[PDB]
Amino acid sequence: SGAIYVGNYRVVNRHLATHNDWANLVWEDSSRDLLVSSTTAQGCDTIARCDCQTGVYYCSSRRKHYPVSFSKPSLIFVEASEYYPARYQSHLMLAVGHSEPGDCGGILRCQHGVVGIVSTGGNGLVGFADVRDLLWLDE
Numbered sequence: 001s002g003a004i005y006v007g008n009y010r011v012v013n014r015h016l017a018t019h020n021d022w023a024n025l026v027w028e029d030s031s032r033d034l035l036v037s038s039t040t041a042q043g044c045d046t047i048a049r050c051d052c053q054t055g056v057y058y059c060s061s062r063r064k065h066y067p068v069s070f071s072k073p074s075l076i077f078v079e080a081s082e083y084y085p086a087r088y089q090s091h092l093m094l095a096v097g098h099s100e101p102g103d104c105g106g107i108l109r110c111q112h113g114v115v116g117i118v119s120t121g122g123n124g125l126v127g128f129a130d131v132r133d134l135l136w137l138d139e
């Protein structure tokens, strides 16, 4: 689990969005596993606007943060689930690191701010849904 709070927005994994998220929907993209809902309180997270390929993510299954090198956002094949059929997930960045399904929502950050959130894993890999291209999150 996990979310990003920036201005009047809440960013979460689309497969983990609640009834409240869907009733206050701003934007969602099934191909990215992202959903953004509106909030009444003002969020104070800073979104990174950069091309960093190094950062730190929080891994709930180990209660630890890990430094990682990660790939540029791209279309990557992802297996079937109770939420999606086998498809290409877009805007995804992979890194070598530990992840388990419950780790989705863990934040990846670089020196500039929030880069993305855990969305995929397995086989000693961890995949992050990028949010740096969502410029409207700041306005």
Ligand SMILES: COc1ccccc1CC(=O)N1C[C@H](C(N)=O)[C@@H](C(F)(F)F)C1
Binding pocket: 015, 033, 078, 080, 081, 082, 083, 084, 089, 099, 100, 101, 102, 103, 104, 118, 119, 120, 121, 122, 123
């Ligand atoms: C953190 O994910 C791990 C980690 C280890 C092992 C397995 C997983 C699960 C994984 O790869 N998923 C990809 C998928 C997707 N984003 O299309 C996610 C979900 F199904 F929508 F919830 C879950």
Ligand SMILES: [Zn+2]
Binding pocket: 048, 049, 050, 051, 052, 110, 111, 112, 113
């Ligand atoms: Zn950066």
